[PDB]
CSV table of C-alpha atoms and ligand atoms in Angstrom, one decimal:
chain,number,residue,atom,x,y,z
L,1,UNK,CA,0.0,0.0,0.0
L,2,UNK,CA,1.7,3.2,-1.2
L,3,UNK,CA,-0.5,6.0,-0.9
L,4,UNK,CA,-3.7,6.1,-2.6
L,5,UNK,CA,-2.5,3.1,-5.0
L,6,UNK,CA,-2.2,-0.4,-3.7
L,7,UNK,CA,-0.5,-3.0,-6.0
L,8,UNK,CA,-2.9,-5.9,-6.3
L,9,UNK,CA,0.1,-7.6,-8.9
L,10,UNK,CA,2.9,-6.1,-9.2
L,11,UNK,CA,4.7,-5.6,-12.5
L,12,UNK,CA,8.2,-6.9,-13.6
L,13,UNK,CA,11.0,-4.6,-12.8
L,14,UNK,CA,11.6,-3.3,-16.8
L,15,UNK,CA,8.8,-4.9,-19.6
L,16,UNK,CA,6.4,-7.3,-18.7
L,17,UNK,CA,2.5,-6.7,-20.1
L,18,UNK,CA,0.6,-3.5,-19.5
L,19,UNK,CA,-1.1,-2.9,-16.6
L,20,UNK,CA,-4.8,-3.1,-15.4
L,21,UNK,CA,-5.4,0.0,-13.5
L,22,UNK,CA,-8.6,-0.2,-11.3
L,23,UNK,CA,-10.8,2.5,-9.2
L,24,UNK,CA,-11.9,2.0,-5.9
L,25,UNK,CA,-15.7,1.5,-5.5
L,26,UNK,CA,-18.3,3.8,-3.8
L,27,UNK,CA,-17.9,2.8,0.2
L,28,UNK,CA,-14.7,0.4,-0.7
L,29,UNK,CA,-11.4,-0.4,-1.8
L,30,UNK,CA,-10.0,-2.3,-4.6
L,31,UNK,CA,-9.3,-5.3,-2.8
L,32,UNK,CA,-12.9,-6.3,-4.4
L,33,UNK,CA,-10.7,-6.8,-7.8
L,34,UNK,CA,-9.0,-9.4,-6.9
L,35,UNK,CA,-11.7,-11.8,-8.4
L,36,UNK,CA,-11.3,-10.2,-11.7
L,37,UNK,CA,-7.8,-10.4,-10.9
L,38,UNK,CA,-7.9,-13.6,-10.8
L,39,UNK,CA,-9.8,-14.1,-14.6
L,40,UNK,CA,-6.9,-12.1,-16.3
L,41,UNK,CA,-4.2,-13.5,-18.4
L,42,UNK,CA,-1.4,-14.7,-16.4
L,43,UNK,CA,1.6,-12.4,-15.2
L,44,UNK,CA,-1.2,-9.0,-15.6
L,45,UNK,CA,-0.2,-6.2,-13.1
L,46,UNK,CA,-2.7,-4.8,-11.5
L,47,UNK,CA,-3.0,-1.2,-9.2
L,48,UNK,CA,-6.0,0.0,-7.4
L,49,UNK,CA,-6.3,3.6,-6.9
L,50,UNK,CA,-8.0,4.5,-3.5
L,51,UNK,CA,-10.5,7.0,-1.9
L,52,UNK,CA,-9.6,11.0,-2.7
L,53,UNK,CA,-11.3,14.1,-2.4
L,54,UNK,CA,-13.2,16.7,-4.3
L,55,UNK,CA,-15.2,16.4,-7.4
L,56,UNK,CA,-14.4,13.9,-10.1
L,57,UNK,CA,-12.7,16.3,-12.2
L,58,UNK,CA,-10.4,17.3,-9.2
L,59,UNK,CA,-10.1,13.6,-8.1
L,60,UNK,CA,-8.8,12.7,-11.7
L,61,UNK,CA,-6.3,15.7,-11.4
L,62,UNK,CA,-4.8,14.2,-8.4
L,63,UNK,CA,-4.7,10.6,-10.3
L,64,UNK,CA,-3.8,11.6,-13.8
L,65,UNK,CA,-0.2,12.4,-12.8
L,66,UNK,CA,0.4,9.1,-11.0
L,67,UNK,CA,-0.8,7.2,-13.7
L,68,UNK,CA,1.8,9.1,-15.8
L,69,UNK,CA,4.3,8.3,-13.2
L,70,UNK,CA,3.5,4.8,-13.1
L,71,UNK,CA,3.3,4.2,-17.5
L,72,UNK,CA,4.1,7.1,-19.2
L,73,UNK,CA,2.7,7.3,-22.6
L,74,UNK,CA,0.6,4.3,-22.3
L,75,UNK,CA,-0.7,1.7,-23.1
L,76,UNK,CA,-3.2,3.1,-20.7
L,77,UNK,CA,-5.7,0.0,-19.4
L,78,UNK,CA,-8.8,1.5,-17.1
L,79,UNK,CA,-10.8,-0.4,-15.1
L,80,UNK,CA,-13.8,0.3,-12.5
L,81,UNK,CA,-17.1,-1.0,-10.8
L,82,UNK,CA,-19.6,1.4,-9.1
L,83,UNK,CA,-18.0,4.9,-9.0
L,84,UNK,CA,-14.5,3.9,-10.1
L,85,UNK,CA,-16.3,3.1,-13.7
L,86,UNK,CA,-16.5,7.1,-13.5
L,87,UNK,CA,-13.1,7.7,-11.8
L,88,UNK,CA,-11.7,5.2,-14.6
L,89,UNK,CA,-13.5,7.5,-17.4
L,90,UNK,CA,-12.3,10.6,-16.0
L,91,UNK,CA,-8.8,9.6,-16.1
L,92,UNK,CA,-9.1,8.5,-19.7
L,93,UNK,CA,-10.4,11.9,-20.5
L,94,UNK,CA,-8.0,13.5,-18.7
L,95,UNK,CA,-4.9,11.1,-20.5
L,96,UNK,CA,-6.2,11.6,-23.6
L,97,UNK,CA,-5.9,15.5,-23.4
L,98,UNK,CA,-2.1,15.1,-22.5
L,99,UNK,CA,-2.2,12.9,-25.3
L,100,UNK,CA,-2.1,10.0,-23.6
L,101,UNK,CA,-2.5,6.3,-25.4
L,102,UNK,CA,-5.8,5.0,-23.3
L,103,UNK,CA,-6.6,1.6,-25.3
L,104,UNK,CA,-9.3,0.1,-22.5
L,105,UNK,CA,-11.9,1.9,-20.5
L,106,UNK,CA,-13.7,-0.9,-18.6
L,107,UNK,CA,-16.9,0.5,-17.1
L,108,UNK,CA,-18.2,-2.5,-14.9
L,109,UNK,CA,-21.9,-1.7,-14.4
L,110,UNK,CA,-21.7,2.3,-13.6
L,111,UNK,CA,-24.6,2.6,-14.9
L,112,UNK,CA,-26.0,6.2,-15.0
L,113,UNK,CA,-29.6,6.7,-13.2
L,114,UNK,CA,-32.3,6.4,-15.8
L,115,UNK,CA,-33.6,9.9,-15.2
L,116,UNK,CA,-31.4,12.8,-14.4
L,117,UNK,CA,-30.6,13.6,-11.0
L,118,UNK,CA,-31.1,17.4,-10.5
L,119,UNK,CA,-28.8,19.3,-8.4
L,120,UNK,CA,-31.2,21.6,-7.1
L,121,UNK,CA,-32.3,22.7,-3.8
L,122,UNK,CA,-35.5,21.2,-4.3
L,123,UNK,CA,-33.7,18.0,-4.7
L,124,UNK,CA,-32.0,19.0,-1.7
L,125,UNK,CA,-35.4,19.0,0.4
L,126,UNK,CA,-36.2,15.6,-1.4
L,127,UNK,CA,-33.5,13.8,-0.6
L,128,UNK,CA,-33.2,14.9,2.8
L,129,UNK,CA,-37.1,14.3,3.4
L,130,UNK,CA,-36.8,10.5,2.2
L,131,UNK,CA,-33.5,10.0,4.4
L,132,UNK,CA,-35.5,11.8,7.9
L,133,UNK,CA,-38.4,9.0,6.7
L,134,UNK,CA,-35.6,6.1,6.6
L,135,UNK,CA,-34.1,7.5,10.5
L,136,UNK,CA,-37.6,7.7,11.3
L,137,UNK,CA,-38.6,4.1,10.5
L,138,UNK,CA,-35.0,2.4,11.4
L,139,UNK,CA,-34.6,4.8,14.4
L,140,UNK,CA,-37.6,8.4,16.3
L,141,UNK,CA,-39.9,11.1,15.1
L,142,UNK,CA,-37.5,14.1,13.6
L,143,UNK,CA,-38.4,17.9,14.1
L,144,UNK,CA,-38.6,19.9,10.8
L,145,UNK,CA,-35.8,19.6,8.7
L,146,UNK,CA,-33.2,23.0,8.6
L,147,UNK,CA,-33.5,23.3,4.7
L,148,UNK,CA,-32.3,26.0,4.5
L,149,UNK,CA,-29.4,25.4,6.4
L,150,UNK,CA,-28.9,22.3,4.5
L,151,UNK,CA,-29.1,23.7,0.7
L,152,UNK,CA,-26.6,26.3,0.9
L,153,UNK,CA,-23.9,23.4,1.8
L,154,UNK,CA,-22.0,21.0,-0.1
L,155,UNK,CA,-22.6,17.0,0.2
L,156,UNK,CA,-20.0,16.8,2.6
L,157,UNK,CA,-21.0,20.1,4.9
L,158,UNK,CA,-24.4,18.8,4.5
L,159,UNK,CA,-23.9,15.6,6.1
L,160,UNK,CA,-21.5,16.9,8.8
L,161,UNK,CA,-24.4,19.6,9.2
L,162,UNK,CA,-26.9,16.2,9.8
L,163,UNK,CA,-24.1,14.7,12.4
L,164,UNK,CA,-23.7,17.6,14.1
L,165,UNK,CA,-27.5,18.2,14.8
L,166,UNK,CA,-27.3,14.7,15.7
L,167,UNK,CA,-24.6,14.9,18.6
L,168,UNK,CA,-26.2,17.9,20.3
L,169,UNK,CA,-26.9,11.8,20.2
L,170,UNK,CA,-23.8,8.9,20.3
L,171,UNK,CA,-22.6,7.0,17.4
L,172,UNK,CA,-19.0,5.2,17.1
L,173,UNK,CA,-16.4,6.8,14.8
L,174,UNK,CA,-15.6,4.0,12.8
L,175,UNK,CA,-19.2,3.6,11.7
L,176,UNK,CA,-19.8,7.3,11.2
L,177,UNK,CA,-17.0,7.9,9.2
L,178,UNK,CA,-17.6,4.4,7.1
L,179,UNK,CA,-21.3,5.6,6.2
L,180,UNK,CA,-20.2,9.2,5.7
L,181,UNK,CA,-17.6,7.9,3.5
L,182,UNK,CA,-20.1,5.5,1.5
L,183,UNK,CA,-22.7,8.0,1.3
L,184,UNK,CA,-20.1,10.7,-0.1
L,185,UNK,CA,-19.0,8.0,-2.3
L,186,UNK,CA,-22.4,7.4,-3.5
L,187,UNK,CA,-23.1,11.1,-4.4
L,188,UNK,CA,-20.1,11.5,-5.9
L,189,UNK,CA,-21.5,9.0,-8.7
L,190,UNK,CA,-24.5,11.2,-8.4
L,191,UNK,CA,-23.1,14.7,-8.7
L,192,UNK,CA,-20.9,13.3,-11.7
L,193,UNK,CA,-20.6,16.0,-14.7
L,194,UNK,CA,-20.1,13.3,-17.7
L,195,UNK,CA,-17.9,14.5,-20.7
L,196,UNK,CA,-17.6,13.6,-24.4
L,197,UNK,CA,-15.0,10.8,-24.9
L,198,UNK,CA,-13.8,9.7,-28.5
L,199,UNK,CA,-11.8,6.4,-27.2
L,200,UNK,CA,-13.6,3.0,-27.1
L,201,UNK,CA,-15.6,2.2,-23.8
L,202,UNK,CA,-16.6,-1.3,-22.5
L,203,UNK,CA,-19.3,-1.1,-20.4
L,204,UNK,CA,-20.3,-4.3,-18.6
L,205,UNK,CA,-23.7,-3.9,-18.2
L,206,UNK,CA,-26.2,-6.0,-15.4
L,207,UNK,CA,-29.9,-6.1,-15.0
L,208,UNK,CA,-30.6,-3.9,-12.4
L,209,UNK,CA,-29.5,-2.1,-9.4
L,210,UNK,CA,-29.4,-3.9,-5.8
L,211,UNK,CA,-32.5,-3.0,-4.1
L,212,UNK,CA,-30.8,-1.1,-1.7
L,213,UNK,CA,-29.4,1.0,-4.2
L,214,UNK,CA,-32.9,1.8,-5.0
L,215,UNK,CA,-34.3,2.7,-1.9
L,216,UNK,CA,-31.8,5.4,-1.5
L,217,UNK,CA,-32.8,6.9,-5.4
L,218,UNK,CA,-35.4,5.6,-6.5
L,219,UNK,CA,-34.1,7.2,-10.3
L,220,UNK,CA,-31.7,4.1,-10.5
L,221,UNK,CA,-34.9,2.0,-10.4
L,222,UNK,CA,-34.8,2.5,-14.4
L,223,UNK,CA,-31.6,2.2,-16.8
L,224,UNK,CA,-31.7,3.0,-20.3
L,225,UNK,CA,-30.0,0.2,-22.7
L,226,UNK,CA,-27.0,2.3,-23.1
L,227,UNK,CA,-26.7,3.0,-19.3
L,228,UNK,CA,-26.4,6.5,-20.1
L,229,UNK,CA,-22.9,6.5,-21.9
L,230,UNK,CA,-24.2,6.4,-25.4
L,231,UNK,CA,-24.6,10.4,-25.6
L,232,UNK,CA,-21.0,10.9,-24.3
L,233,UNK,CA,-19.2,8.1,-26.2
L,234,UNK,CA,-20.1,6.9,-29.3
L,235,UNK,CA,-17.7,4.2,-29.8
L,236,UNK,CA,-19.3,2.7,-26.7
L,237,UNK,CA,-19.6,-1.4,-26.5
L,238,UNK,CA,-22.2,-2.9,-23.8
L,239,UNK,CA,-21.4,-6.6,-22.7
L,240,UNK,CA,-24.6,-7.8,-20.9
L,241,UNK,CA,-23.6,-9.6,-17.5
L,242,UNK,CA,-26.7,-10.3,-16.1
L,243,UNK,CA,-27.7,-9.7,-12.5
L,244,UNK,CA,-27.4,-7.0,-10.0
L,245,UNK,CA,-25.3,-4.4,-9.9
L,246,UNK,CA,-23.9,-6.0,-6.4
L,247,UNK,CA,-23.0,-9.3,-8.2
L,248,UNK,CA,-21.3,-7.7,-11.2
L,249,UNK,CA,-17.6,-7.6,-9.2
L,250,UNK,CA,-18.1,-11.3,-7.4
L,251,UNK,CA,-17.8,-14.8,-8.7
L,252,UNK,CA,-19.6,-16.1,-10.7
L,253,UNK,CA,-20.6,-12.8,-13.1
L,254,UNK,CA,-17.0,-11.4,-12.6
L,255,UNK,CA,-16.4,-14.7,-14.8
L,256,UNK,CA,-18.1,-13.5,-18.0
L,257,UNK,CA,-16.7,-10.1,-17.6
L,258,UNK,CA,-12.9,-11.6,-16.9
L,259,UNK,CA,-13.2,-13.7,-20.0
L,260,UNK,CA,-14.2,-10.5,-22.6
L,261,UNK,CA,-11.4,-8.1,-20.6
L,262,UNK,CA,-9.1,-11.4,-21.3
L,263,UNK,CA,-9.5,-11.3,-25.1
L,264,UNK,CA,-9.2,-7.2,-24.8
L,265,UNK,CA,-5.8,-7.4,-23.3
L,266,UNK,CA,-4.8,-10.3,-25.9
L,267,UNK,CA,-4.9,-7.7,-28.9
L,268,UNK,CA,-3.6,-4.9,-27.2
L,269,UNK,CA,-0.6,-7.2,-26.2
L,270,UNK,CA,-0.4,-8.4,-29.6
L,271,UNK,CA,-0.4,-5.2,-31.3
L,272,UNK,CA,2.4,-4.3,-28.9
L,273,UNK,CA,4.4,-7.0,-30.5
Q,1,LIG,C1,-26.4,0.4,-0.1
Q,1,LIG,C2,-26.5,1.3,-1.4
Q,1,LIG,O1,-26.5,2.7,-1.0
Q,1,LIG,C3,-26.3,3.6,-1.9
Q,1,LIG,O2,-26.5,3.3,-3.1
Q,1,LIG,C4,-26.3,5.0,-1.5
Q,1,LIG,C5,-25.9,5.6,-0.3
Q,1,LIG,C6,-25.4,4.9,0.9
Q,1,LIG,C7,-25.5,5.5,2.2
Q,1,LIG,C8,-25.0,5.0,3.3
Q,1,LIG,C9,-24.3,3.8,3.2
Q,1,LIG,C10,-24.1,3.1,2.0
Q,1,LIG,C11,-24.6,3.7,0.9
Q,1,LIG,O3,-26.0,6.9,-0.3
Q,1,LIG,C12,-26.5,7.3,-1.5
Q,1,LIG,C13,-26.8,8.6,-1.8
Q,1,LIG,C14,-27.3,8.9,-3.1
Q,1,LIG,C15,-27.5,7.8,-4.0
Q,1,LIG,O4,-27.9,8.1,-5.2
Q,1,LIG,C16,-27.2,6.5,-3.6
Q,1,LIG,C17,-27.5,5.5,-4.7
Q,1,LIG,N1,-26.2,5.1,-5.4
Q,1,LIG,C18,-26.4,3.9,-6.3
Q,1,LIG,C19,-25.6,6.2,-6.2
Q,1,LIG,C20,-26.7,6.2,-2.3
């Protein structure tokens, strides 16, 4: 562990075959790679990039240079479930404008919400409505909720806002900052502002979202056949998996999408050669 990237399989000291480069998911790490890991070609290197700060495009400005540390021109190879599928796409943006040789984006199930998310302050009130419902049911009745308070804040002052109020009552650090971290995760996938990429984009594509998933935005209920990439890429492959999006990283569905990433890294090491 070095950082904010942990080597899952390290390369060779010169040469070798080019790494897989994979993006934490929302409310983990990239240990949950190591089954994919596992389906790729013999003697693949593989790096997880962890948990940073800011938006996105900010996040991908902190990881863009370490990828260039680590490879250089290329061959680029980037992989991600759940919010790294966005993290991965970002940093292919952002090596493609350096000019950057990005020959994989591997988007496993980050699958857009099938109707826009606003990001309004009405939305603000909605969201925070259905989560006081969800502390009311689980928990409690809870006073009227400080909207305005609430709406001039970003995700992260609004949920320190929400912790604060609830102090004043005791929860354990380790779970607050795990959910805080899981629910800023989440949101980041939300608040994402999608750009226009011209390189070719796998995108490994379930049923459906956990219900879980669902209960917290009910707009993920839906996904278009496309999961929402088609507008931004239009070299854009879908490889159907099947499932939920919770069983698209574990055996057995990681199987199916180990097996097409396979053949990917094949040609690109060929065409190396
Ligand atoms: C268990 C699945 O929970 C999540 O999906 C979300 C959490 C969450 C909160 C606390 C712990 C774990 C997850 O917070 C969110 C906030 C917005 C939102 O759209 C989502 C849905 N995501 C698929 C994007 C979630």
């Amino acid at each position: 562990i070095d950082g904010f990237v942990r080597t899952l399989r390290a390369r060779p000291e010169a040469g070798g075959k080019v790494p897989v480069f994979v993006f934490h998911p929302a409310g983990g790490s990239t240990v949950v790679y190591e089954p994919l890991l596992g389906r790729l070609p013999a003697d693949t290197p593989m790096y997880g990039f962890e948990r940073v700060e800011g938006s996105i495009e900010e996040r991908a400005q902190q990881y863009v240079p370490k990828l260039i540390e680590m490879q250089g021109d290329g061959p680029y190879v980037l992989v991600g479930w759940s919010l790294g599928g966005v993290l991965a796409y970002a940093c292919a943006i952002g090596l493609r404008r350096l000019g950057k040789d990005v020959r994989f984006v591997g988007l496993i199930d980050a699958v857009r919400a099938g109707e826009e998310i606003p990001q309004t302050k009405e939305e603000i009130r909605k969201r925070w409505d259905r989560y006081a419902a969800f502390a009311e049911k689980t928990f409690v009745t809870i006073p009227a909720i400080p909207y305005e308070q609430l709406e001039e804040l970003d995700d992260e002052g609004q949920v320190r806002f929400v912790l604060d109020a609830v102090s004043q009552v005791q929860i354990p650090a380790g779970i607050i900052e795990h959910q805080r971290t899981s629910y800023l995760d989440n949101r980041a996938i939300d608040t994402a502002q999608i750009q226009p990429y011209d390189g070719h984009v796998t995108l490994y594509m379930a049923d459906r979202y956990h219900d879980d998933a669902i209960m917290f935005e009910p707009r993920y209920a839906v996904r278009q056949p496309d999961g929402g990439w088609g507008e931004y890429v239009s070299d854009l492959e879908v490889v159907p998996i099947g499932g939920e999006h919770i069983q698209a990283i574990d055996e057995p569905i990681i199987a199916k999408v180990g097996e097409h990433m396979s053949r990917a890294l094949g040609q690109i090491e060929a065409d190396r050669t």
